[PDB]
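Researcher: Sequence recovery benchmark, item below. Answer with residues only.
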């Protein structure tokens, strides 16, 4: 009945590992594009289906490889994921927003045929690590068509974003680079009260927790993307009535659960 629904009924165990789909990659060379530094597209193969798309940005001084595990994890659960490299490794968060915007336009207008055949360009979301997550919040403000945004241990000097795009922010308790008291939590609190939003804080986690395989990040990022990109309400169970011992803070206005 939901034409965008993919994969068997989820289990928490299943969302901590690569999913039902084989994954291929397409390397986007830096010279092949303008507006961002190229990157890697992870996309499902062995299938004739189409899937929503996600543009993902790494953080300060980092490249696409720092989120390669997450790009492949999301792809394997049924998404087309472009993890970008930036024009300069020292680009700030608003620059990363512009480069996410170029990456989304590339997906919708300049995709390789192998990517486009697996892509429903009408259903796009964004995600990002650190300054990349700052850029995710800025692009959510500009582009109301986005289905979801997931900033991972985000960093931004701007603390105030206006968007109706549903936002789930992942904070890291022990983050000294983007302390949650100065970034993640102000971001959550200053988002509109009418916008479906969730803040989770991983116990004992560091700023680099998003840069390698992480069960909690996998569960919440897949579930948020499934819920909003696919309208797949089967993933409400992991985001609602939440009792998760991996988490040491949880905040929501609960607008995503019905
Ligand atoms: O995106 C990241 O992971 C990230 C974000 C911020 C810093 C940082 O040191 O902020 C202080 C200095 C600002 C520019 O020098 C480092 C890394
Ligand atoms: Ca602002």
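Model:
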């Amino acid at each position: 009945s939901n034409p965008y629904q993919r994969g068997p009924n989820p289990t928490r165990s299943a969302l901590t590992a690569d999913g039902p789909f084989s994954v291929a990659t397409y390397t986007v060379s830096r010279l092949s594009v303008s507006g961002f530094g190229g990157g890697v597209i992870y996309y499902p193969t062995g299938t004739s289906l189409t899937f929503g798309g996600i543009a993902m940005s790494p953080g300060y001084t980092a490249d696409a490889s720092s989120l390669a595990w997450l790009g492949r994890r999301l792809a394997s659960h049924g998404f087309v994921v472009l993890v970008i490299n930036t024009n300069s490794r020292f680009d700030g968060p608003d620059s990363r927003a512009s480069q996410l915007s170029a990456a989304l336009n590339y997906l919708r207008t300049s995709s390789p045929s192998a990517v486009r055949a697996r892509l429903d360009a009408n259903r796009l979301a964004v995600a990002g690590h650190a300054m990349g997550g700052g850029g995710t919040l800025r692009i959510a403000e500009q582009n109301p068509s986005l289905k979801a945004a997931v900033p991972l241990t985000p960093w931004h000097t701007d603390k105030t974003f206006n968007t109706s795009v549903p936002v789930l922010i992942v904070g890291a308790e022990a983050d000294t680079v983007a302390p949650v008291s100065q970034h993640a939590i102000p971001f959550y609190q200053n988002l509109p009260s009418t916008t479906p939003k969730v803040y989770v804080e991983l116990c004992n986690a560091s700023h680099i927790a998003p840069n390698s395989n992480n069960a909690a990040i996998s569960v919440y990022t897949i579930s948020w993307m499934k819920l909003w990109v696919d309208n797949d309400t089967r993933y409400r169970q992991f985001l609602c009535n939440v009792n998760d011992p991996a988490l040491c803070d949880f905040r929501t206005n609960n607008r995503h659960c019905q």
